Amino acid sequence: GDSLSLEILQIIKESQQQHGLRHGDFQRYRGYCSRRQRRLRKTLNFKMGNRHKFTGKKVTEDLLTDNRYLLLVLMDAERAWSYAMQLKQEANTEPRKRFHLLSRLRKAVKHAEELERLCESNRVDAKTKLEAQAYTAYLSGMLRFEHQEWKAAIEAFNKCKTIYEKLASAFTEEQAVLYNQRVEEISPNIRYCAYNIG
Amino acid sequence: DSLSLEILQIIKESQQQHGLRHGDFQRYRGYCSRRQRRLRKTLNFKMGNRHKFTGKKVTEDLLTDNRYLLLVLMDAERAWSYAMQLKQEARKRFHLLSRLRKAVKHAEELERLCESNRVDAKTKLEAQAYTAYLSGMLRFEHQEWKAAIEAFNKCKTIYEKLASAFTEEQAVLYNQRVEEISPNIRYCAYNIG
């Protein structure tokens, strides 16, 4: 039970709401993630160098004695995704921005995949493994949706739904709210995919 | 469920990265202030919206997460850093004692907050141990030897208990804090006689 934990959905939702997404300011949110990531990098560099005064031994043996490296990768994902969503706003009128949109969205999935694999570590708790898999499925669905790959998108969104519903069942109705609203959040996407496979 | 605040791990990693260990006391204060400002904004944002319907049954408050506790911890650390700077910049003794007493009062606030049933057992002990350590330091610098040894002994007992309760890995931090105050305890004892 001294496992690592990362409350991924809680972290991203609370961050997104405070730092710009109340009014679709994805540029503001990306800025925030970037500043957080920089603080995290400096801390990781310090911890990986830190040594005990008496014995001279390293204080922190690897990147997984706390959740900070996991959080650094999550910021990379969130930064790429917010950049993609900014570009989507711009591409509405500037079609030339679509390449850059698609590149950033794929980048977000890639970072989520990296985070998910890190969470497969036996030091990471079971709830976080579910969180990381659900996050990757969400972003995979978003990338597939933007490419109009409707069946692959609905597979990803349905996987996301199934995992969050699993999560919500292991908890009280008060704890489950965030997971349930996340399912509500992707339901318009699931609807749209289903009718394109009609 | 319960709130957790790993007080000793936070203060040691923070003092080490942000200046205090190599005598850049003002840099450490700045870091505490900047962290506080970020915590204040998050807390204001949360509390500012708490009257909105979002599907929850419970209304958020300052003990919904540990951010308010961490805010108070940073006050005690800023006061401690001023005290440490003065200890080095060595009437000025009165200012030293004043800064130490302020750090103690902040720690006492954090300890009272942690009396809440929202806060876990481990965190209550960490808070008690932190207050005891700062109280010991105040009394020690004022040559109140018996009172200093009482506080340091309480501090040592609690950290030994925490060292003895978890992983061999977590024990190292707590054991090192016990090492740190052992010379103070010896000095008190030989003044008492």
From Swiss-Prot, chain A:
Region feature (RNA-binding): 1-198
Phosphoserine, modified sites: S187
Assembly: Heterodimer with SRP72. SRP68/SRP72 heterodimer formation is stabilized by the presence of 7SL RNA. Component of a signal recognition particle (SRP) complex that consists of a 7SL RNA molecule of 300 nucleotides and six protein subunits: SRP72, SRP68, SRP54, SRP19, SRP14 and SRP9. Within the SRP complex, interacts (via C-terminus) with SRP72 (via N-terminus).
Coiled coil location: none
GO biological process, one term: SRP-dependent cotranslational protein targeting to membrane
Recorded family membership: Belongs to the SRP68 family.
Residue numbers of the full-length protein present here: 55 to 252 of 627
Cystine bridges: none
Subcellular location as annotated: Cytoplasm; Nucleus, Nucleolus; Endoplasmic reticulum
Alphabetical UniProt keywords: Acetylation, Cytoplasm, Endoplasmic reticulum, Nucleus, Phosphoprotein, Ribonucleoprotein, RNA-binding, Signal recognition particle
GO cellular component: cytosol; endoplasmic reticulum; focal adhesion; nucleolus; ribosome; signal recognition particle; signal recognition particle, endoplasmic reticulum targeting
Major localization class: cytoplasm
Protein name (database record): Signal recognition particle subunit SRP68
Record text about domains: The N-terminus is required for RNA-binding.
Disease: Neutropenia, severe congenital, 10, autosomal recessive: A form of severe congenital neutropenia, a disorder of hematopoiesis characterized by maturation arrest of granulopoiesis at the level of promyelocytes with peripheral blood absolute neutrophil counts below 0.5 x 10(9)/l, and early onset of severe bacterial infections. SCN10 is characterized by infantile onset of neutropenia. Anemia and thrombocytopenia may be transiently present.
Source organism superkingdom: Eukaryota
Function: Component of the signal recognition particle (SRP) complex, a ribonucleoprotein complex that mediates the cotranslational targeting of secretory and membrane proteins to the endoplasmic reticulum (ER). The SRP complex interacts with the signal sequence in nascent secretory and membrane proteins and directs them to the membrane of the ER. The SRP complex targets the ribosome-nascent chain complex to the SRP receptor (SR), which is anchored in the ER, where SR compaction and GTPase rearrangement drive cotranslational protein translocation into the ER.
GO molecular function, a single term: protein domain specific binding
